[PDB]
Structures are given as structure tokens and as C-alpha cells.
Write a protein that binds this DNA or RNA. Structure first.
Ligand SMILES: [Ca+2]
Ligand SMILES: [Ca+2]
Ligand code: NA
Length: 342
DNA sequence: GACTGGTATTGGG
DNA sequence: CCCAATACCAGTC
């Protein structure tokens, strides 16, 4: 197999530079303004300038405006970003019908049948970079390998405005030498569990008892990591079928008052039914994020489809149940639907 | 902040 | 009860 992964460079900030040539040269910081007080929220994307002056994704807007107050700070236009994103995906379709969109700024292409080797893979990568820059004035980073995981790591190594091949020999090396924390799907918490079991590199998963690994990180991760380590991972490039669909929103003020919370819950439900489109769910869970950012949820599965009306009615009973059983103020509220009708 | 997927824990016909 | 249903834990972007 030959896989080509495309990752748009510092996407949201870059798109603002397109829509406003002026931002040329300026550090640019796109934020999620949560609306709870002035500058409440976090940084979504920071361009290269902002980064070298110590600004990065996921830090508070205020903590960022300390570290460098000089930068230009903008708000999300998810919809505008989505239009650009969607168009770029359509351009990628031109190069391969076997596409997997992983997020608003990332996609895999299976080009096993569109090229013969990595020399030609690299060349097509350049065509893609040219074509996207030409149509959308957005640079991307392209990673190329024998599977999805190593294609993604290639791009991580080559960011920004890059292109990289990890060949069969570099795969073997990385299996032994790549910090396992840098493998997609492995976060700080898993890395720390892995490290205490003596597992710092992919290859290490081959010298521990499976049951111990599975017992510590669950079966899916253990198998995932082992199949990579044996150089046998080969999941097809295919857009994944969602098992749940939902929405969760931050409230402007923390609360336990149903009549304050409902508007948010009901909007979240309505937008969830727009996303559901034609799928009818049989399960609903109401999810509350408390004022200390703990996550509580209550749910119910029905023996039949749930209409939006039923969702409204049932959501309220589930929110009441949460309010009965946890005394904290609620900060975010939302819902998750699942168990769709075949 | 806003999502979803996986799974240890749990309770009801 | 013990397995489908929970209500968490976790990673990503
Ligand atoms: Ca990305
Ligand atoms: Ca990116
Ligand atoms: Na990681």
C-alpha cells in the first residue's frame, strides 16, 4: 500500500491571511472566545510568528496576551474554514477516489493504484501542494508512507510547508527509535502508563506479555501498537462511520437553574438532529461539564427511534437526574446520540 | 473548547 | 444474577 497524508499548515490563521492580505508578517492568533467574560477562552491556532514568541494552541487567550500582547487575535469562522476545507477535499478527490477525511484540515489518500513507488508518490505530493496553493493560497504539509500512521508521522516531521517520505527502511528504524508518545492515538496519559511498563518505543510492545499490555491500555490500543511494531498495520483509507453524534456548548454563566440551562441543551439537541440528518438514534445521553471541569453524564436507551420531541422531553429528565445527583454548578451542557436504526 | 471512540463498571427482567 | 447499557476515560484538532 502507499498512503499520502495531507495536513493544512496552521489552517485557521492561514485562512485569515488569505481573506486579509494585510496580516502578512503579523503574528496571528485564532481563538475560541467562550463569552463568559472579556477574553474568556483559548487559542485554536497560532501562526509561525506567534509560535516563535511562545504562543501555541490550547493556552488561555489571556495567558497568551501576557506572553505576547502585541499579536492580532481573531475569532472562529468555522463555517468559512469549512468552505475552504471542503473545496480542498474536492481537489484531493481528483488525485484519488480512496480518500479518508480525518478532520477539517487533514485527509489520507490511498494512492497504491495511482503511482508505482515513492519517487512517483513524492512527485504527486508536489503536484498536490502546487494545486492547493494555486487554487486556495494555502500551503500544506504532505507525508508519504506504507500506511496511515507513518504517513501522518511523516507530515508531523515535515511541518510546516513540507513534504516527506518515510520509506520501508525508515519505518523499521522508527519502530525501534521513535518515542512511542509521538505515535497517533497515544496521549500523555497512555505514554505514562506505557513508560511504567517499560515501553518507550513501538518495538517494546513485542517484549511484554499481551495481557499485561491489554490490561493496562485496553485491547484496541494494544493490538494497534503491536500491529505497527510488527510492520503489519494496514487499515484501509475509508471515511469512518460515526457511532455517536452530538453537541456540547459552554454556558455564558455557571448554573443549576433548569431554565438557564435548557436553552443551551435544546439548541445542542436541534443542531444534533441537523447533523443526524436521516439517522434516527435509539440512545441519548446528556453530558454536563461541571464548574471544576469534571464530566458527568446520564442516559437512556429506548427500544425504538427517538424523535427530536422525545429528545427534548427526555433530555430534561436526564438533566434533572444530574442536578439531583451532583451538587456542583454546571458549566457546559450537551448531548450525545447513538445506537442508530439500521 | 468541542468533539468522538473504547471500555470498566453496573444493575434490572 | 451477568451481559447490554451505562458513564466514565482518553486523544485529537
Ligand atoms: Ca492538523
Ligand atoms: Ca494543521
Ligand atoms: Na502523543
Amino acid at each position: 500500500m502507499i498512503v499520502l497524508f495531507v495536513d493544512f499548515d496552521y489552517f485557521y490563521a492561514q485562512v485569515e491571511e488569505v481573506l486579509n492580505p494585510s496580516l502578512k508578517g503579523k503574528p496571528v492568533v485564532v481563538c475560541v472566545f467562550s463569552g463568559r467574560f472579556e477574553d474568556s477562552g483559548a487559542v485554536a491556532t497560532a501562526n509561525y510568528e506567534a509560535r516563535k514568541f511562545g504562543v501555541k494552541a490550547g493556552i488561555p487567550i489571556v495567558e497568551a496576551k501576557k506572553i505576547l500582547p502585541n499579536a492580532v487575535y481573531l475569532p472562529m469562522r468555522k463555517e468559512v474554514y469549512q468552505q475552504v476545507s471542503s473545496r480542498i477535499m474536492n481537489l484531493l478527490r481528483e488525485y484519488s477516489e480512496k480518500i479518508e477525511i480525518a478532520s477539517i484540515d487533514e485527509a489520507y489518500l490511498d494512492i497504491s493504484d495511482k503511482v508505482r513507488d515513492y519517487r512517483e508518490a513524492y512527485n504527486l505530493g508536489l503536484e498536490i501542494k502546487n494545486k492547493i496553493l494555486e487554487k486556495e493560497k494555502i500551503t500544506v504539509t504532505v507525508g508519504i508512507s506504507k500506511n496511515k500512521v507513518f504517513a501522518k508521522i511523516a507530515a508531523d516531521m515535515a511541518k510546516p510547508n513540507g513534504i516527506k517520505v518515510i520509506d520501508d527502511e525508515e519505518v523499521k528504524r522508527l519502530i525501534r527509535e521513535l518515542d512511542i508518545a509521538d505515535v497517533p492515538g497515544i496521549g500523555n496519559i497512555t505514554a505514562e502508563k506505557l513508560k511504567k511498563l517499560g515501553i518507550n518505543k513501538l518495538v517494546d510492545t513485542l517484549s511484554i506479555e499481551f495481557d499485561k499490555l491489554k490490561g493496562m491500555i485496553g485491547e484496541a490500543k494494544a493490538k494497534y501498537l503491536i500491529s505497527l511494531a510488527r510492520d503489519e498495520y494496514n487499515e484501509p483509507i475509508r471515511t469512518r462511520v460515526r457511532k455517536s453524534i452530538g453537541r456540547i456548548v459552554t454556558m455564558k454563566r455557571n448554573s443549576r437553574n433548569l431554565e438557564e440551562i435548557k436553552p443551551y441543551l435544546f439548541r445542542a439537541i436541534e443542531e444534533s438532529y441537523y447533523k443526524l440528518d436521516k439517522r434516527i438514534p435509539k440512545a441519548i445521553h446528556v453530558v454536563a461539564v461541571t464548574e471544576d471541569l469534571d464530566i458527568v453524564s446520564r442516559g437512556r436507551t429506548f427500544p425504538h427511534g427517538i424523535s427530536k420531541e422525545t429528545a427534548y422531553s427526555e433530555s430534561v429528565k436526564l438533566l434533572q437526574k444530574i442536578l439531583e445527583e451532583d451538587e456542583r454548578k454546571i458549566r457546559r451542557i450537551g448531548v450525545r446520540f447513538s445506537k442508530f436504526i439500521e
